[PDB]
Amino acid sequence: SRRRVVITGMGMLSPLGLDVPSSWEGILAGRSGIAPIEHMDLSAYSTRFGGSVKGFNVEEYLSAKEARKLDLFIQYGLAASFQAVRDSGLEVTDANRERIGVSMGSGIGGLTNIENNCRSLFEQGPRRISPFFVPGSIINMVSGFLSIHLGLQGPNYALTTAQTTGTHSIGMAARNIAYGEADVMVAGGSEMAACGLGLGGFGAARALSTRNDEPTRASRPWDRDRDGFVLSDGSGALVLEELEHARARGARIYAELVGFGMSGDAFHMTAPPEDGAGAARCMKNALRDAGLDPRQVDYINAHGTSTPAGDIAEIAAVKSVFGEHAHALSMSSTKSMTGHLLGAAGAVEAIFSVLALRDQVAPPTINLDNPDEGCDLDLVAHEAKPRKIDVALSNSFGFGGTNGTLVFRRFA
């Protein structure tokens, strides 16, 4: 048997806002967070826009001295984690600190720092590399700094599964609680890949939208005029907690995490199979883990990246899994508004799936002006749809054919 896992705290930085409620207000209003990237000469690049975090003040979280040691993606992950722990109301004590851990991940980690230290090495040589370069750029330092700051002695680790990172981080933290290795975990992901190397790396693969003239219309999942993903920055963190632990302290419970699925496509390094076979196995595994029939699903937060092959693969997977229920559920891509936060995508989308359950509303897929061939599901085009949602799924698909699915249920 297995313990039950609930969500008692959430925290976020996104292109829509510097916390959860601001971001969520943007989501339900159909607002875009996408804009031309500032303070960077992107003349030579084929994409000049993305989803930046606007107005982030690290000194709300860290001293200027500790902030100078840490890449932006670590700053973002710590901001989301501190927000989530504050939101949970949890009091860390000597009686519980060995039972509270962290799994905050990243797909790409400290590209900005790597770029800046490369500049020093190439121009001046290795004596200009920062002493804090390695520990301030490695992906496990959100988990590391968080544990140090709050005195958390439970399982401490970090996943890096590309665009699936935030989903796998949350799912595996839920397993740690369900199987009694922890009572509380802070889990999610963070990303800041808007450097030359990030825009340039994805651009070299021709993976990005190049709709420079209308950045807010670039991210258009399932639209016939889509031309690749939009790169975005930010973080999401959830406090996962064992149910009896949450009830005993009078925690506010947002939702229950009832299932987690993983699978591998074993197909291609960057493209999914056209029929979404791996995404179908992953969703079936998550529903089996939850003891739910596909017909019980009400809302899917799609991966929905705005790539030709990815968006159509997801439609095929959902039709395969859900059969005569495939049109009854609502499925939307919040990446239509946020762009693609890579390893933080699954974290901010798990939060949006939990809020869909709290507020009984499916967020819109904006920009879905002309659904592509076979994209005939309820994709919540243009505007939020109030509806009944008892069960919400969140999907992530990543490079290497790595798949994750989370299943959330209303808690009463």
Per-residue H/E/C for 197-227: HHHHHHHHCCCECCCCCCHHHCCCCCECCCC
For a second copy, the closer of residues 284 and 358 by Cβ is 284
Distance of closest approach, residue 267 Cβ to a second copy, in angstroms: 7
**Minimum gap (Å) between residue 73 Cβ and a second copy:** 13
Site for ligand Q63 in 127-166 (CB under 6 A): 134, 137-139
Euclidean distance between CA atoms 259 and 395, whole angstroms: 12
In the complex with a second copy, the residue whose CB is nearer, 62 or 381, is 62
| Min CB(135)–a second copy separation in Å | 5
User: Should residue 68 be labelled a site residue for a second copy when binding is judged by CB under 8 A?
Assistant: no
- Residue 204 touches ligand Q63, criterion: CB under 6 A: no
- For residues 300 to 319, the per-residue mask of contacts with ligand Q63, x marking binding by CB under 6 A and - elsewhere, is --------------------
Rank residues 112 and 332 by Cβ distance to ligand Q63 and give the closer one: 112
Name the residue nearer to ligand Q63 (CB basis): 78 or 257: 78
Check: CB of residue 361 under 8 Å from CB of residue 262. Answer: no
Instruction: Please say which residue, 70 or 392, places its beta carbon nearer to a second copy.
Output: 70
Q: Kindly write down the DSSP assignment for every residue of 37-89, as one continuous string.
A: PPSS--TTSS--EEB---S--GGGTS-HHHHHTS-HHHHHHHHHHHHHHHHHT
Is residue 200 a contact point for a second copy (CB under 8 A)? yes
Q: Terminal CA-to-CA distance of the chain, rounded, Å? A: 22
Distance of alpha carbon 192 from alpha carbon 233, whole angstroms: 5
Instruction: Choose the one of ligand Q63, a second copy, none that binds residue 126, judging by a C-beta under 5 to 8 angstroms depending on kind.
Output: a second copy
Q: Which stretch binds a second copy (CB under 8 A): 115-123, 241-249, 316-324, 380-388?
A: 115-123
Least distance in Å: CB of 74 to a second copy? 10
Q: How many CB atoms lie within 10 A of CB 120?
A: 15
Give how far the C-alpha of residue 336 lies from the chain's centroid of Cα atoms, to the nearest Å. Answer: 14
Q: Which does 110 bind (CB under 5 to 8 A by kind): a second copy, ligand Q63, none?
A: ligand Q63
Contacts with a second copy in 261-300 (CB under 8 A)?
A: 262-270, 278, 281
At 253, is the secondary structure helix, strand, or coil?
coil
Q: Is 179 exposed, middle or buried (0-12, 13-18, 19+ CB in 10 A)?
A: exposed
